[PDB]
Ligand binder design. Structure first.
Ligand SMILES: Nc1ccn([C@@H]2O[C@H](COP(=O)(O)OP(=O)(O)OP(=O)(O)O)[C@@H](O)[C@H]2O)c(=O)n1
Ligand SMILES: Nc1ccn([C@@H]2O[C@H](COP(=O)(O)OP(=O)(O)OP(=O)(O)O)[C@@H](O)[C@H]2O)c(=O)n1
Ligand SMILES: O=C(O)[C@@]1(O)C[C@@H](O)[C@@H](O)[C@@H]([C@H](O)CO)O1
Ligand SMILES: O=C(O)[C@@]1(O)C[C@@H](O)[C@@H](O)[C@@H]([C@H](O)CO)O1
Ligand SMILES: [Mg+2]
Ligand SMILES: [Mg+2]
Lengths: 246, 246
């Protein structure tokens, strides 16, 4: 009932060659592949631009689609896979980012289901932040929601800003921050629409691909899950933490 | 063609008693009144909760409406004024905040005009920030817009966050920052709608009354003016600056 595509370019800047970094005997990309398998997805494809990533995935028995080196985000890379596989417009695609080796299968299913149950073009998920270090870390993307759960904005800045608390000091946070997880649900037809839009100025400043959608006035629904152990892997520090936790 | 209402409660927390602070021989509230007069507004009302504010305005020949002490924002206070004056729903109201003694008359007129020409419930304005101090100052409210100029979010946080520039240092900013001005255009019918909503959690965290509107899924249009003098008076530092510049 849904397809998972995992975008995994080699030349990440904050952690070069990250799809292939070892985590307890397997490259990160293979761990993400396993989360996708566990979700029950009908088809799972790794999209990459690098032969060494392709070989690792093929050796783990996963399907691979080679894609252009000049894509500027995972979602842009997905559109090439979508065109090559010729998915119907109504086919549900879940982008599980190659930097999320600990994302639970249940969360993958939840995003697909949430998307299919709403007339929204794109669905995603966030989890509460419980410590101030993460609230003030620009590598942890924060998201602020409206009353219906649609995203107002995603940012690397600390939003929503707590005026009175932070005027005092920056060492504590209340119970109102949300960390955005690297996963998106969207139908193939929406992915097509996404790459047909001209890039927003906003997405390039924050380096957050989802801002293109908000810029063109479309909604993103964000479900909130209370507990999800682990973290995405964007820095050397993230990698050490994940190595220890898995 | 429009009514100006200036909300001015006495007990500000960041600058106590600010409607009465001396700015070069006249209290701040009287300067705001003078800006409102210059706009050509058909009627101008200062809404206050304090007799000494009332007296300063009356001594300057201005109209005063006493209002409850328990209002939690200028917009809430304006609703009491709208009922007491029994304005019709379609009456165009411009909230010129009591902390904007330097706001140009042209900007006041522009917000009223923008509101009237659009199907939108609420209109406001922002000005490009070209210095790093204001961009990183939580007393300067930043806003990020969509392609059509509707607000995605308003925040005291530094948005949009420049990932690559700021990873290096906070010394400089690009050209992508907008400072929100303390002026709102809305019809009386919208003000009535605003206070029919239960308060949002979001507005209390940021201490930004306009966030109630985004929380409940309604739009705010933001015009951008390229050049606007002065600043909002919220801190002692702002007060020194406006005293030097007015
Ligand atoms: N041009 C890009 C950038 C990102 N991705 C993929 O999208 C996912 C999420 O992006 P991110 O974690 O930020 O990866 P990078 O962009 O590669 O890393 P960095 O931002 O540090 O440069 C990653 O699996 C990455 O491989 C992609 O396919 N093409
Ligand atoms: N409960 C409130 C708070 C604000 N205002 C008015 O709304 C305008 C903008 O608010 P702000 O500049 O923040 O004033 P204060 O809320 O009074 O100051 P502070 O946030 O420092 O406590 C001001 O003219 C203020 O008098 C109001 O009428 N009632
Ligand atoms: O920079 C990352 O964290 C990634 C790429 C972004 O474009 C965006 O998808 C982001 C998510 O917000 C999760 O952090 O993941
Ligand atoms: O806090 C202020 O700056 C004021 C009160 C807020 O509720 C909001 O209206 C704000 C504007 O964003 C202008 O700064 O003005
Ligand atoms: Mg990236
Ligand atoms: Mg205030």
């Amino acid at each position: 009932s849904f397809v998972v595509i995992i975008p995994a370019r080699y030349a990440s800047t904050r952690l070069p060659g990250k799809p292939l970094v070892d985590i307890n005997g397997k490259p990160m990309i293979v761990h993400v592949l396993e989360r996708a398998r566990e979700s029950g997805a009908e088809r799972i494809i790794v999209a990459t631009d690098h032969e060494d990533v392709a070989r690792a995935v093929e050796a783990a028995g996963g399907e691979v689609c080679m894609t252009r080196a000049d894509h500027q985000s995972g979602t842009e890379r997905l559109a090439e896979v979508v065109e090559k596989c010729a998915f119907s417009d109504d086919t549900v695609i879940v982008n599980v980012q190659g930097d999320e080796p600990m994302i639970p299968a249940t969360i993958i299913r939840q995003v697909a289901d949430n998307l299919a149950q709403r007339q929204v073009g794109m669905a995603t998920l966030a989890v509460p932040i419980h410590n101030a270090e993460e609230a003030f870390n620009p590598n942890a993307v924060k998201v602020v929601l409206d009353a219906e759960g649609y995203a107002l904005y995603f940012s690397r800045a600390t939003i929503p800003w707590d005026r009175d608390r932070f005027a005092e000091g920056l060492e504590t946070v209340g119970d109102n921050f949300l960390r955005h997880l690297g996963i998106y649900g969207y139908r193939a037809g929406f992915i097509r629409r996404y790459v047909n839009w001209q890039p927003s100025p906003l997405e390039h400043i924050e380096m957050l691909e989802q801002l293109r959608v908000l810029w063109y006035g479309e909604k993103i629904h964000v479900a909130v899950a209370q507990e999800v152990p682990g973290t995405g892997v964007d820095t050397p520090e993230d990698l050490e933490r994940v190595r220890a936790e898995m």
